[PDB]
Amino acid sequence: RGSHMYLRITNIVESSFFTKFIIYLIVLNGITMGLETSKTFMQSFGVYTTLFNQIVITIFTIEIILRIYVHRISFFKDPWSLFDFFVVAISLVPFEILRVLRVLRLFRLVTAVPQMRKTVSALISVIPGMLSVIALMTLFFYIFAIMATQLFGERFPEWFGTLGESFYTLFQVMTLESWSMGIVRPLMEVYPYAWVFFIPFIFVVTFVMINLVVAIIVDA
Amino acid sequence: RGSHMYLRITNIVESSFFTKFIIYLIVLNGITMGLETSKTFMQSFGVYTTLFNQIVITIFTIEIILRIYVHRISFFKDPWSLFDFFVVAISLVPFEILRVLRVLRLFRLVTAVPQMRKTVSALISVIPGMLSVIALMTLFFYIFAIMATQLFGERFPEWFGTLGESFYTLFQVMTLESWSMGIVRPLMEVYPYAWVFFIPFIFVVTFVMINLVVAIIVDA
Amino acid sequence: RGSHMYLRITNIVESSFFTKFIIYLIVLNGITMGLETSKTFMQSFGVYTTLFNQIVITIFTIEIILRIYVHRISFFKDPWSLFDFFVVAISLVPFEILRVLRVLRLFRLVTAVPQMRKTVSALISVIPGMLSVIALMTLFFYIFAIMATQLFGERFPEWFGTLGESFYTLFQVMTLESWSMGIVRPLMEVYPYAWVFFIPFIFVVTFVMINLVVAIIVDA
Amino acid sequence: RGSHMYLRITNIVESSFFTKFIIYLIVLNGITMGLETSKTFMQSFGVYTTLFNQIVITIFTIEIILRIYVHRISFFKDPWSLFDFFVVAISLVPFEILRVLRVLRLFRLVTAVPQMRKTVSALISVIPGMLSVIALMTLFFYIFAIMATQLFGERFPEWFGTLGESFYTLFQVMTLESWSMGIVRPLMEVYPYAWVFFIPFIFVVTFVMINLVVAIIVDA
Ligand SMILES: CCCCCCCCCCCCCC(=O)OC[C@H](COP(=O)(O)OCC[N+](C)(C)C)OC(=O)CCCCCCCCCCCCC
Ligand SMILES: CCCCCCCCCCCCCC(=O)OC[C@H](COP(=O)(O)OCC[N+](C)(C)C)OC(=O)CCCCCCCCCCCCC
Ligand SMILES: CCCCCCCCCCCCCC(=O)OC[C@H](COP(=O)(O)OCC[N+](C)(C)C)OC(=O)CCCCCCCCCCCCC
Ligand SMILES: CCCCCCCCCCCCCC(=O)OC[C@H](COP(=O)(O)OCC[N+](C)(C)C)OC(=O)CCCCCCCCCCCCC
């Protein structure tokens, strides 16, 4: 708990060399994961690189293990460690989507470098003051998604045949991407007043967005 | 007016249980209205759900009735109640567009939950300081819509054949959606100087938009 | 100069009735110009409406004449009058583009209604603090327009064959409209490194835009 | 170092006539470079204009030479001169991409006119406070670019077959250009859950952008 061998390990994990080594590895596994992208490189130096990968996964597990010895329950209430935990855990399951999620370990460069932690933490910090407006927005989407599903799903199954599909399309209308040439004008060929649904939608959603952003600037 | 039975009802509508019950119903009729979206679910449990729907419509009418007993003319000068009124009234007419408008009762979650009321009320509050710029903008749209109708409606009836059609297209140009690839470049094949109409339009409309948004930030 | 008949006319133009009458006409000629949009209406009540139009043009010329008697050289240093002048002058030439420009007289509702004048004047007021950045931007466009004309005009004459054409396309890239799917990806089929031209362009132009807008907010 | 002939040259380069002459040339070589765009003009007055071009290149080399005599090592620590240096150097190599880069000398109008220098310098000044967020963003792009390359490169080689290609597409998704109609909806025909990759991408990238812009406004 504060004994002979505890304090030995503690002085290692807390050493700058520990951090730097880990950061050094992250930038290295980073570059390695970008070259693994090339089947040319993969064909030649490929096995070299599978090697470096479990090496790094092992080093990271050892590290995480140590960090829990040194920190115990303090470790499992730290966001930055919990991230490092789950990211490294993912990289330990041997469903290809998990093989790809391995790349999430590169986000450890964020947890590791305090300049980054501080940046991310600044960004995350404005989200709580947004929840109420975001709650309002989601209700809005949900309601309009229902309305659109049953107004247009039958003739327009791809875009609106399903509550989820309508959610997708409504998000696309919010981003303004092809909303008129690709969605609303087609609808109007069948539903001449469809414009009464999407223009108010676009007005509300955009007004909310601007205010949401004025919200952020309301602290500064 | 302040009698024996009046004060009895008053203590019920004003009870927290009343509010919570109503909110409870709203979240329930909400989920129900999302499952009604699926013809699978509709095929199986469908009648169960038509049931829950008039049940809720009845409960809501009773509630609204009570709330007017307790509030009388104060009720009909409250936005939040007037909304609840009109929304529930809609849900009472038996034109499919009214069947769909029933979903508007889910917005009662806004009127009911004071955190939401406050949010919405914040948003709505900035609109009056915008009316003058919005008035200016609409005049602008109207004038340019007339000009475009008669400059391009004859060769381009779909986009500009009608004052309303031109309004629609001009709105789409304002959102910047396909303005060049899908509208102005086609026009230029017939009207080489059409760019003299839409670039200034896009300049004015965008300048106004930014200032409109600086307007909001002019209080904060 | 300040005589018997001068002061008589002066009391008329300066009367509220004068202003209101003019405003009344503007809203009327406004509605009339929107109905002239319909060949149906035009077919039936059409001549009624050509009538109301020169009537109003005459009334407006008389008014402008009076206003110069009452104001003399003060009139020709007022923006709002100079506008009214040029707009009404246009409406007096009998080239269809002038027939359409007649609709610009509806902007007299702006000059006439002081709430509008004040709004417009607020908007116009931020433009001088932008000129320097706008000068920078235009130079930027000019230079990149030259570069693009000679990098891509030969294989891509429609988009870049001409300094003006390149100006048009570059403006479209700035608005982000189809910049990749419709312009840059096509170019890359011939010029694989074209992305080195348009991504920096899009970066600079967007950075400038944001700062231009922060500029406005730098007073507030 | 501060001798007879040194101080003679010094009084010339530091003269207002020197600056004005140079500026005069820049506006002239500017106009000339825009007319060189027309093969009509090129066909007729073309050689006149190749002439004016080396004339100006020579004058500029002489100038730069002088300015280094007058300034020595102070010259090579000035951004504005270093620019003028490299821009003029480019214009001295006789690979067509260098023939086009000659047009970069028009940016000397920026270095020369102090109102511009000040503007540019204002703009550049906000960039250092952005580096941390920009670092975060680039890491984000890199990681998602890797993930997309291996999730979609095989079936969608054009958009994602290569780390660079995925970088390009991800940038396009960030600008929101055709992200749904032209990229994600096509992907979903093969990968129904692709929406789980690009919506969070679009959320993060947009949130960061707004905060990056609130950053700028955080000084004002
Ligand atoms: C005030 C009220 C608050 C209510 C909050 C809770 C809402 C809960 C959502 C309800 C669940 C709806 C699920 C559902 O019906 O799924 C539909 C479809 C699959 O149905 P399926 O039977 O396969 O459709 C057949 C297709 N057809 C018609 C073309 C032949 O599959 C999908 O589309 C999947 C569903 C995706 C959408 C989920 C949206 C969650 C929104 C949360 C809003 C929170 C507001 C605060
Ligand atoms: C300073 C002046 C202020 C004036 C303010 C008041 C303006 C009032 C609007 C005038 C009414 C115009 C109605 C009208 O002409 O409707 C046209 C069309 C249907 O005409 P129709 O005869 O069916 O066209 C035949 C089609 N064709 C030529 C291709 C064979 O149907 C439509 O397009 C319907 C009309 C939709 C547009 C309504 C716009 C309202 C703008 C309000 C601006 C307020 C400014 C403060
Ligand atoms: C520091 C330097 C400052 C210099 C400022 C002054 C610049 C003055 C602009 C120079 C004039 C260029 C005019 C010109 O060459 O016009 C080209 C074309 C028509 O040429 P054309 O001979 O018909 O082309 C034949 C077509 N082809 C090759 C496909 C067979 O026709 C057009 O494209 C018309 C020209 C439109 C563009 C005008 C742009 C003005 C930019 C102002 C920038 C101010 C910066 C502060
Ligand atoms: C925390 C970790 C930090 C790591 C930072 C350092 C990252 C260094 C990047 C790694 C280098 C990757 C180069 C590479 O693999 O190039 C791939 C391709 C050409 O490969 P190739 O063998 O031709 O592909 C064959 C094509 N196929 C499969 C369809 C038959 O060619 C390309 O696509 C060229 C590569 C372009 C992308 C360069 C991106 C630099 C991102 C910098 C991020 C900084 C973060 C702070």
To test the pocket of ligand 2, the residue of C26, C29, C31, C37 to mutate (highest count of ligand atoms within 8 Å of its CB) is: C37
DSSP B40-77: HHHHHHHHHHHHHHHHHHHHHHHHHHHHHHHHGGGGGG
Residues contacting D46, CB < 8 A, separation 6+: D36
**What's the CA gap between D109 and A21, in Å, rounded?**
49
Q: Are B142 and C32 in contact (CB under 8 A)?
A: no
**Distance, CA of C155 to CA of B183 (rounded, Å):** 24
Resolution to one decimal, Å: 2.8
Q: Up-side HSE of residue C56: CA atoms within 13 Å toward CB?
A: 27
Tell me the C-alpha distance between B60 and B66, whole Å: 10
Buried-state track B120-143, b at ≥16 Cβ within 10 A, e below 16: beebeebeeeeebbebbbebbbbb
Q: Which residue in the block uniquely carries the two structure tokens 């050689």?
A: D47
DSSP string, D2-71: -SHHHHHHHHHHTSHHHHHHHHHHHHHHHHHHHHTT-HHHHHHHHHHHHHHHHHHHHHHHHHHHHHHHHH
Q: Which of A36, A38, A44 to mutate to test the pocket of ligand 4 (most atoms within 8 A of CB)?
A: A38
Q: Is D30 annotated as a binding-site member? A: no
> Ligand 3 centroid to D109 CA: how many Å?
18
Best residue in C134, C146, C160, C202 for a mutation probing chain D (most D CBs within 10 Å)? C146
Helical axes A195-219 vs B114-125, angle rounded to 10°: 90
- What is the rounded CA–CA span in Å between residue A47 and residue C178? 42
Q: Who's near C220: CB < 8 A, 6+ residues apart?
A: B214, B217, B218
C103·B162 Cβ contact <8 A:
no
| Shortest alpha-carbon distance between residue A205 and chain B (Å) | 12
Which distant-in-sequence residues (6+ apart) come within 8 Å of D140 by Cβ? Answer: D204, D205, D208
- The distance of A105 to chain B (nearest Cα, Å) reads 38
Q: Do D216 and C211 touch (CB under 8 A)?
A: yes
Beta strands in B23-173 (DSSP E): none
Q: What is the largest CA-CA distance in chain D?
A: 80
Name, in order, each residue with C-beta under 8 angstroms of D125's C-beta and a sequence gap of 6 or more: none
DSSP 3-state assignment of B78? Answer: coil
Q: Please indicate whether residue B143, judged by its CB atom, sits closer than 6 Å to ligand 2.
A: no
Interface of C with B (CB under 8 A): 30, 33-34, 37-38, 100, 103-104, 106-107, 109-110, 115-116, 118-120, 122-123, 126, 168, 171-172, 175-178, 182, 213, 216-217, 220
- Give the torsion sign (CA, B33, B39, B40, B46): positive
Instruction: Report which ligand 2 atom has the smallest distance to the Cα of C29.
Output: 2
Backbone φ and ψ for A219, nearest 5 degrees, come out as -75, -55
CB atoms within 10 A of CB D4: 6
Give the number of the atom of ligand 4 that is nearest the alpha carbon of residue A36. 15
Chain C positions with Cβ closer than 8 Å to D? 132-133, 135-136, 139, 142-143, 146-147, 149-151, 162-163, 176-181, 195, 199, 202, 207-208, 210-211, 214, 217-218
Most distant CA pair in chain A: distance in Å?
80
CA distance linking residue D152 with residue D138, whole number of Å:
20
Please provide the size of chain A in residues.
Answer: 220
Distance C156 CA to ligand 3 centre (A): 17
A27: tokens are: 């930038």
B151: closest chain C residue by CA:
C100
Which chains are adjacent to chain B, needing at least 3 Cβ pairs under 8 Å? A, C
| B160, two tokens | 């500009």
Beta strand spans in D72-216 (E)? none
Cβ–Cβ under 8 Å, residues D64 and D88: yes
* Under 8 Å between Cβ of A87 and A109: no
Listed in sequence order, the residues at least 6 apart from D150 whose beta carbon sits closer than 8 Å to its beta carbon are: A37, A100
Q: Which ligand gives the minimal distance to the CA of D157?
A: 4
Neighbours of A43 (CB within 10 A): 8
Could you tell me how many residues make up chain C? 220
Two tokens, residue B98: 């009214």
| 8 Å CB contact of A175 and D179 | yes
- Report the alpha-carbon distance of residue C65 to residue C162 in Å, rounded: 46
Instruction: Indicate yes or no: CB of D181 within 8 angstroms of CB of A171.
Output: no
H, E, C per residue of C52-75: HHHHHHHHHHHHHHHHHHHHHHHH
Tell me the C-alpha to C-alpha distance, in Å, between residue B5 and each of B2, B8, B59, B70, B73.
Answer: 8, 5, 20, 11, 19
On chain A, the residues whose CB falls within 8 A of the CB of B130 are none
Chain B: closest CA distance from residue C2 (Å): 37
Nearest to A172 by CA among D147, B158, D183: D183
User: How far apart are the C-alpha atoms of D72 and D58, rounded to whole Å?
Assistant: 20
| Long-range interactions of B64-69: CB distance < 8 A, separation 24+ | B64/B88, B66/B9, B66/B12, B66/B13, B67/B13, B69/B6, B69/B9
Q: Does ligand 3 lie within 6 Å of residue C186's CB atom?
A: no
List domains and CATH numbers for chain D.
Answer: 4-126 (1.20.120.350), 129-217 (1.10.287.70)
CB B75 within 8 A of CB B67: yes
Our answer on whether the CB atom of D37 is closer than 6 Å to any ligand 3 atom is yes
The DSSP code sequence of chain A is --SHHHHHHHHHHTSHHHHHHHHHHHHHHHHHHHHTT-HHHHHHHHHHHHHHHHHHHHHHHHHHHHHHHHHGGGGGG-HHHHHHHHHHHHTT---HHHHHHGGGGGGHHHHHSHHHHHHHHHHHHTSGGGHHHHHHHHHHHHHHHHHHHHHHTTT-HHHHSSHHHHHHHHHHHHTTTTIIIIIIHHHHTT-TTTHHHHHHHHHHHHHHHHHHHHHHHHH-
Count CB neighbours of C119 within 10 A: 20
CB contact under 8 A, D37 and C146: yes
CB pairs under 8 A between B and C: 75
